[PDB]
Amino acid sequence: QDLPTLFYSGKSNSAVPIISESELQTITAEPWLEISKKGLQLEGLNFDRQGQLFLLDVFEGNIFKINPETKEIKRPFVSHKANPAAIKIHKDGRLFVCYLGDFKSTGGIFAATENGDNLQDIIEDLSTAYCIDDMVFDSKGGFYFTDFRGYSTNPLGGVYYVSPDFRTVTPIIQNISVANGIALSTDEKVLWVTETTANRLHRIALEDDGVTIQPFGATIPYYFTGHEGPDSCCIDSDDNLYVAMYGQGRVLVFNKRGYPIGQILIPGRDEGHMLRSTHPQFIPGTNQLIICSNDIEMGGGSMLYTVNGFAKGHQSFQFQL
Ligand SMILES: [Ca+2]
Ligand SMILES: [Ca+2]
């Protein structure tokens, strides 16, 4: 575990650090496992109850299952829906796959066993205009998802909440220029959302009903910078937020109050390599972070990188007892 590590030193230990990105505690990720020498748009990291890693690639729709110990890579099935972008495992073991469809309106969410059986349309694709990029389950089995639509000045995107019985969809926050990453705080009273095409971080304080925003509760604690923008995110047990930066070859880390406290660089970024860092996720029961990226832009491969985060990963829904 002699991996580069993030510590609570200097301004990384302050509740409200006044600091610039160039001054952030920074480490460079170590190569962990090459998924392929061919360029694949890796995304959707998620570990099952047995600690096995699941992920996928957007353009081909391959679903991969990796053994963290042996490093064995399996490709159980392929998405029957176009451009899947995330995998969130349910408490019952099912894999929920978010997909973008035609990037205009035919996205949605389907569920299936880890072998690709029992395909279920959780959020049907053609009846609604959503193009879903990611989601996060609450402790009740309900979930919040990101509507990945629009662009900079055309905020068609937003965040919606699906009831535990999957029968209702409630808008949480709209007018977002491509909602991408999403995460719930450990107490599930704060929702973090990334807006890719406008480079903004959203922090949303929720009422006890989990759907109503507290007065003046949705704010912009951080304005990102650089092409292209923030991507997927996850938290750790200390409520820090890890945000993969798409096209920037890095991951930014924020404390529970939304202040930057860490920075993780992907090797080769300065030369234009592996800039497509899309998703961060912890190996269950540890503080070892895995980050997927790819070198499609340079005709390179698809690689998973690793570093040690500030704390152990949070026990999300798939680990509930
Ligand atoms: Ca749709
Ligand atoms: Ca994403």
CATH number of the domain within which 131 lies: 2.120.10.30
Kindly identify the ligand whose nearest atom is closest to the C-alpha of 99.
1
Instruction: State the amino acid at position 72 in one-letter form.
Output: E
Structure's resolution in angstroms: 1.7
Sheet of strand 169-176: strand arrangement? 132-137, 143-147, 157-162, 169-176
* 3-class DSSP state of 316: coil
Question: Max CA-CA distance within the chain?
Answer: 51
Query: 71, 297 in Cβ contact below 8 A?
Result: no
Q: Given the structure tokens 């399996």, which residue do they identify?
A: 74
Distance 227 CA to ligand 1 centre (A): 27
Phi, psi of 21 (to 5 degrees): -55, -40
Q: Spell out the residues 6+ positions from residue 321 whose beta carbon is closer than 8 angstroms to its own.
A: none
Sign of the torsion angle spanned by Cα atoms 316, 166, 218, 197: positive
- Between strands 260-265 and 26-28, the pairing is parallel
Query: 262, 255 in Cβ contact below 8 A?
Result: no
125 is in an annotated binding site: yes
Q: Indicate the number of domains in the chain.
A: 1
Q: Quick one: which of 268, 269, 265, 260 has its CA closest to 250?
A: 265
In sequence order, the β-bridge partners of residue 252 are 243, 263
Report H helices in the chain: none
In sequence order, the β-bridge partners of residue 233 are 243
133 is in an annotated binding site: yes
Phi, psi of 198 (to 5 degrees): -125, 0
The H or E element that residue 109 is part of is: strand 108-112
Q: Quick one: which of 190, 195, 192 has its CA closest to 210?
A: 190
Experimental approach taken: X-ray
Q: Spell out the residues 6+ positions from residue 65 whose beta carbon is closer than 8 angstroms to its own.
A: 52, 53, 54, 73, 74, 75, 76, 114
Q: Given the structure tokens 């340079």, which residue do they identify?
A: 298
Query: 306, 288 in Cβ contact below 8 A?
Result: yes
Distance 128 CA to ligand 1 centre (A): 4
Give me 95's structure tokens. Answer: 């894999």
* 3-class DSSP state of 297: helix
- Active-site residues: which are they? 231
128 is in an annotated binding site: yes
Q: What is the DSSP letter of 56?
A: E
28: left (phi over 0), alpha (psi -120 to 50) or beta: beta
* 3-class DSSP state of 48: coil
Kindly identify the ligand whose nearest atom is closest to the C-alpha of 279.
2
Q: What is the DSSP letter of 16?
A: S
Distance 232 CA to ligand 2 centre (A): 4
- Domain that includes residue 175, residue range: 1-321
**Surrounding residues of ion ligand 1, Cβ less than 5 A:** 107-108, 125, 128, 130
Q: What is the DSSP letter of 186?
A: T
Whole-Å CA distances, 58 to 31, 42, 100: 21, 7, 9
Q: Given the structure tokens 């790819």, which residue do they identify?
A: 294
Distance 281 CA to ligand 1 centre (A): 26
Q: Count of residues for the chain? A: 321
